[PDB]
């Protein structure tokens, strides 16, 4: 099945909207991690392929995803990076987990019906 970008946007955008609707949980994920601003010079030692909601949104908006799995991969990349870098005791890690739960719940029926 070849998907039109507009069909992908239509189908997938609500799952991204669900992530943004999580407040305050999505707030650390809405822009790329800035290690200079945050004083964390080892961030890019640990995280080689950064990802965040703004990047995912731009890619969906501009039709960069050919297939739904590619979107799903970038969402999980974002989550995996945050789980890798941050300690499980941290607020950011727990918020990562909350967003991943919401994502799993929302993406499931969407993938089925694609």
Out of 14, 17, 21, 31, point to the residue binding ligand EL0 (CB under 6 A).
31
Helix pair angle (68-85, 5-20), 10° resolution: 30
Burial of 89 (0-12, 13-18, 19+ CB in 10 A): exposed
Q: Which of 27, 32, 111, 100 is nearest to 67 (CA)?
A: 111
Q: Does 86 bind ligand EL0 (CB under 6 A)?
A: yes
CB 43 within 8 A of CB 51: no
Q: Kindly state the smallest distance separating residue 101's Cβ from ligand EL0, in Å.
A: 16
Task: Name the one range near ligand EL0 by CB under 6 A: 4-12, 36-44, 55-63, 105-113.
Answer: 36-44
Is 85 near ligand EL0 (CB under 6 A)? yes
Kindly list the residues in this chain that would bind ligand EL0 in the complex (CB under 6 A).
Answer: 24, 27-29, 31, 33-34, 37-38, 40, 82, 85-86, 91-92, 95
């Amino acid at each position: 099945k070849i998907f039109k970008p507009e069909e992908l946007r239509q189908a997938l955008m609500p799952t991204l909207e669900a992530l943004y609707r999580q407040d305050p949980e999505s707030l650390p994920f809405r822009q790329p991690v800035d290690p200079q601003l945050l004083g964390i010079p080892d961030y890019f030692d640990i995280v080689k392929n950064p990802m965040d909601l703004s990047t995912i949104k731009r890619k969906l908006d501009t039709g960069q995803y050919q297939e739904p799995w590619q979107y799903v991969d970038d969402v999980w990349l974002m989550f995996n990076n945050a789980w890798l870098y941050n300690r499980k005791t941290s607020r950011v890690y727990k918020f990562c987990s909350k967003l991943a739960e919401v994502f799993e719940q929302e993406i499931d029926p969407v993938m089925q019906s694609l």
